[PDB]
Each structure stands twice: as structure tokens, then as C-alpha cells.
Amino acid sequence: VNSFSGYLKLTDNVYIKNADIVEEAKKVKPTVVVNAANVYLKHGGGVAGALNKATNNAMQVESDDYIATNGPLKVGGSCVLSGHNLAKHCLHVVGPNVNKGEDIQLLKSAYENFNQHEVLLAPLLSAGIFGADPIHSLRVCVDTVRTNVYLAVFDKNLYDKLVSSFL
Ligand SMILES: NC(=O)c1ccccc1O
């Protein structure tokens, strides 16, 4: 049993809810919250900007030190950093950004990072301002992630379309 509440069960391991991931993280304090990161860990907008704002910019300060030491992530890659006030850990995962022309086949590689963690609170990778089709992102998630994933979908209209169209 875990603390996640109000989710619709899509599969054995994937759950979904219309929720603000920031508000969900603050309530649950999950072991892992996933950030929709870019390779520079520049948390300007979308999910990343919202998570970073909720940490009072501490996520960005930590991320800048990580990049200064290690250099940029790979598209499809990840790193584990602090979850600050939101979670124990933040798994920063880089899905491909269609608005930068990145290979959508890298979305499966991005979701494979989730398999290193038994339970996660996450957004749909490459959705929102990353430009991918969220229906596609949910299909790749279900077909790639084997660990238990709780997906937060900010937009109620999109949530209802994801559920209604789910195969
Ligand atoms: N998932 C989001 O994009 C988000 C979440 C909280 C506040 C602003 C936001 O844009």
C-alpha cells in the first residue's frame, strides 16, 4: 500500500490523475518526483519551472552546481538530485523536445530511466511545451515502465482525452 489517492488505474503498474504535480508532491512527499528536464537543467517553464519555483529556486542552484561538475545530460538520460521540499529525490529526465527537432524514438529511452525506481510521481515525458503528442507519451510510458508510476496530468481537458482514448 502507498499514499497516492484518487488515481485511475490504467494497467498493473501505471496510474493517472488530473493534478498539479507540484501540489501532489507537496501532499504525498514521494520518494521520487520526476522533472521534465532539459540537458542543461535550466528549469525555466513547464513542469520544470513550476517544480523549481516551488523549491524557491533551490532546485536551480543545485542543478547549476551539477552541470558545472558533470556537463549536460543526454537527451533520453537522467540524473538523481535532491527533491528539496517536494520529495526525497528528484529524477531529472530529459525527453526529446519536438520544438528543438529531437528524435521521438528517444522517448522510450527517457522512460527507461523510471525502471531504476520502484515508485515514482511523474509527468508525461515530452508533453506540454516539449511538443510531443501526450497520447503517444502515455502509450510509450505503459509499454516501457515496469515500476509503479503515478502520472499527474495538469490539464483536465487532456486528462479526460487520455483516459477516454486509452487502449
Ligand atoms: N505542469 C505544469 O506545467 C505546471 C504546474 C504547476 C504550475 C504551473 C505549471 O505550468
From Swiss-Prot:
Membrane topology: Multi-pass membrane protein
Cellular compartments annotated: Host endoplasmic reticulum membrane
Catalyzed reaction equations: Thiol-dependent hydrolysis of ester, thioester, amide, peptide and isopeptide bonds formed by the C-terminal Gly of ubiquitin (a 76-residue protein attached to proteins as an intracellular targeting signal)
Impact noted for substituting T31A: In strain: Mu/B.1.621
Domain Macro span(s) in chain numbering: 1-167
Modes of activity regulation: Inhibited in vitro by GRL-0617.
Quaternary structure note: May form homohexamers. Interacts with N protein.
Function: Responsible for the cleavages located at the N-terminus of the replicase polyprotein. Participates together with nsp4 in the assembly of virally-induced cytoplasmic double-membrane vesicles necessary for viral replication. Antagonizes innate immune induction of type I interferon by blocking the phosphorylation, dimerization and subsequent nuclear translocation of host IRF3. Also prevents host NF-kappa-B signaling. In addition, PL-PRO possesses a deubiquitinating/deISGylating activity and processes both 'Lys-48'- and 'Lys-63'-linked polyubiquitin chains from cellular substrates.
UniProt protein name: Papain-like protease nsp3
Species in which this protein is naturally found: Severe acute respiratory syndrome coronavirus 2
